[PDB]
Amino acid sequence: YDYTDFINYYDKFKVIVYNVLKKLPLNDEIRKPVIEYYLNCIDYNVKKGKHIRGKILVLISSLSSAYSNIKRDSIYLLGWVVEAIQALILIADDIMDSGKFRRGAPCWYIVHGQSNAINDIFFLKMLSLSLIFELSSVFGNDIVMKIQKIYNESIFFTVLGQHLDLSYFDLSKADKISERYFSMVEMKTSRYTFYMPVFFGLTLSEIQVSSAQLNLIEAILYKLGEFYQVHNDVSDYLFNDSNADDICRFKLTWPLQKSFEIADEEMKLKISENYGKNSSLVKDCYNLLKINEHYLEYQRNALDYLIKLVKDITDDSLQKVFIHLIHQISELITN
Amino acid sequence: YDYTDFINYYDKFKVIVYNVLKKLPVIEYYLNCIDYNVKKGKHIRGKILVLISSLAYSNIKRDSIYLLGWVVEAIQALILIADDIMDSGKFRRGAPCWYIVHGQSNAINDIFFLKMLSLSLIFELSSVFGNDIVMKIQKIYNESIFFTVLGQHLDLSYFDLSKADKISERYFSMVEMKTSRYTFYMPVFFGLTLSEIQVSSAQLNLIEAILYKLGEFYQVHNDVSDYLFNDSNADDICRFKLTWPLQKSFEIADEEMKLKISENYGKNSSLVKDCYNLLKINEHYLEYQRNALDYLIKLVKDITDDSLQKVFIHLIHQISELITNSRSN
Ligand SMILES: O=P(O)(O)C(O)(Cn1ccnc1)P(=O)(O)O
Ligand SMILES: O=P(O)(O)C(O)(Cn1ccnc1)P(=O)(O)O
Ligand SMILES: [Mg+2]
Ligand SMILES: [Mg+2]
Ligand SMILES: [Mg+2]
Ligand SMILES: [Mg+2]
Ligand SMILES: [Mg+2]
Ligand SMILES: [Mg+2]
């Protein structure tokens, strides 16, 4: 789709941004490249990262209830709010995971120190919170309250998911591993990534009134969800050769859980051991059973399943939005 | 005061968090996070929420209030765990900082826990007071932590000693933002809201003028305690922080001491402190803290409502007692 226009709204978002930082009263503005620090921050973090999720809200927003003026902009804004929200999440993430890189540029916690990273996170959170309260002018009180409730659930869930991700207690005799993993992925990834933006979408959209069987869309966003997380995990096993990444950590991953549904007593002693220590050797075992083989299997049932539940949408017009959605996601994973 | 039983509602406050946690080990993780971080300490800021909220005794939004109080206790704890990382805190409230018992990745993550939680429990007050109140509660919170963060940025963003014509102005400006206003404006302003009191808005900026100096006076002491007792490189000076003492010493030092500070600032805090004592800076807090109180009292004495200068008399009493009955001899 076009989508160039959302992306052009940025500059009114920094207007709308900069036009908050009138925070102190009675001076000639000297103490006040604080306002310059955080515009910088925004260009760096919010101004990179594909803007996948903000797209999804603006996408979903433009079909369920086509717009034509003057709320159109309240949507772009939130879509950049989404992006600002996502960004703060992965600033946090890159810290916890000692990451190096993101959105092309190195990690913010790297450049501006970790102590500043932590402050800027909740800066971005607090601007998002207060920016969401702008809508009330354009969209009315209850439609912003439903937007709140959605912000809260998704960011909270992400926080419990991110907690499982951190949890030091992955064990040897683990046969629920597949269920630890996937249902964490639902929390730490699918909520903010797909649930939040899509469900944002049709608050602003406010149409149509689809209910009851509307657990269907939350069943697609779930799978899109782990579709993503499960692609991001593979690309890590496939595509980084550093002297410490993922399985260096005790990182509950897709190639590790289904190497635990195929491997033997002998293999599962392989993983257990040099996990956290020897990623190459663990990566080797991964090769042996060719992780990206079955990975290529996941993908087609994972698209098959999305496909068939696509053609079960009550909204012929929202049927195709998700088919659009499912399409770019795949492509985006296929790059 | 009591107060008993805002503290005793902590139980009922826990139950409401556990029920937020029907998602569905993590539960027992985060229930202990809150006991570890929220249950522990003086609870001064949630104490303030009720006090102000005290003198419409008509509904059982008296639980509701309490939970808010404990929501306010959560916000300070999740502020402060942030702080202890950024500052290399060792101990807070007599106990190992959270990022220490639970490392940085979790302390960072759990900050997000304490704060979404804050957000959710607030969101569910719509029933008890209804839409307009919550909406307004929602907007103190946003300013309060928003300014706190800017305030925390400034604490991180180091000053220019060389150009210290008025670092004091930075100091007090930073101070009002990183402290005053999640400590004082937010608690006080939540409680002014739940109450819905009659309402002397014109007479607002006065009590607003009070919170400014409740706040100032709060930090100013903290900064001096650190100066007075903290013995390490993990300290104010070694960490190169902008603080009442060094701010004053620049107001109070000849061109000798002041050049001799900005060199050991902040490597050999021993030497930085040596000066203060021969600036006798602890002399200068006391005449501060001395003038702090009456100016709060003058200030307090001008509150019109007369049922709202009451609790603002207890408020002023509480903090000064708090700030004065520390390590004395
Ligand atoms: O694998 P992670 O969960 O750390 C990641 O996917 C980020 N993330 C964090 C929460 N959900 C996803 P990324 O590989 O982008 O660093
Ligand atoms: O000295 P800080 O301002 O960092 C402090 O007073 C905490 N704080 C943080 C913001 N306002 C106050 P603490 O000495 O308790 O670590
Ligand atoms: Mg990561
Ligand atoms: Mg991660
Ligand atoms: Mg990853
Ligand atoms: Mg500190
Ligand atoms: Mg500090
Ligand atoms: Mg201090």
Element spanning B190, H or E: helix B186-195
- Give DSSP secondary structure letters for A138-165: HH-HHHHHHHHHHHHHHHHHHHHHHHHH
Contact B126 A116 (CB under 8 A): no
Closest C-alpha among B64, B6, B44 to residue B195: B64
What does the alpha-carbon distance between residue B298 and residue A326 come to, in Å, rounded to a whole number?
A: 67
Q: What are phi and psi of B96, to 5 degrees?
A: -45, 130
Strand, helix or coil at B91?
strand
Contact A129, B148 (CB under 8 A): no
Q: What is the C-alpha separation between B14 and A49, in angstroms, rounded?
A: 39
Local structure of residue A313 (DSSP, 8 states) = -
- Which residue of chain A has the CA closest to B173? A24
C-beta neighbour count of A75 within 10 angstroms: 25
Cα separation, A330 vs A31, in Å, equals 48
CA distances (Å), A170 to each of B24, B102, B325, in order?
19, 17, 48
Of ligand 2's listed atoms, the one at least distance from the Cα of B225 is 14
CA of B152 to the centre of ligand 7 (A): 7
Q: Output the DSSP codes for A187-218.
A: IIIIIIIIIHHHHHHHHHS------SSTTTHH
Residue of A nearest to B152 (CA): A119
- Tell me whether residue A142 is annotated as binding: no
Pocket test for ligand 2, best of B42, B83, B170 (most atoms within 8 A of CB): B83
B324 touches chain A (CB under 8 A): no
CB B242 within 8 Å of CB B167 = yes
The one-character DSSP state at B181 is: I
How many helices (H) and strands (E) chain B has is answered by 16, 2
Domains and CATH numbers, chain A: 1-335 (1.10.600.10)
Complete DSSP assignment for B277-290: HHTTSHHHHHHHHH
CA distances from B76 to A54, B43, B59, B124, B187 (A): 32, 9, 28, 20, 10
**Model resolution, angstroms:** 2.4
What is the four-CA torsion angle of A253, A256, A259, A263, rounded to 10 degrees? -150
CA distance B30 to A101: 30
Ranges assigned E (strand) in A76-117 = 101-102, 105-106
Give the burial class of A19: count Cβ atoms within 10 A of its Cβ; 0-12 exposed, 13-18 middle, 19 or more buried.
exposed
Q: How far apart are CA A230 and CA A212, in angstroms?
A: 29
Tokens 């009675």, residue located: A26
Asked if residue A314 lies in contact with residue A210, where contact means CB atoms within 8 angstroms, the answer is yes
For the purposes of burial, counting CB atoms within 10 Å of the CB of B24, is it exposed (0-12), middle (13-18) or buried (19 or more)? exposed
Dihedral pair phi/psi, residue A105, rounded to 5°: -80, 160
Please check whether residue B275 is in contact with residue B261, taking contact to mean a CB–CB distance below 8 angstroms.
yes
Give the integer Cα–Cα distance in Å for B83 and B226. Answer: 15
The type of residue at B243 is: T
CA dihedral sign of residues A72, A75, A77, A79: negative
- Which of B30, B78, B116 to substitute to test the interface with A, most A CBs within 10 Å? B116
Supply angle C-alpha A269, A270, A276, rounded to 5: 105
Strands (E) in B103-190, as ranges, are none
Cα angle B126-B128-B130, degrees, rounded to a multiple of 5: 45
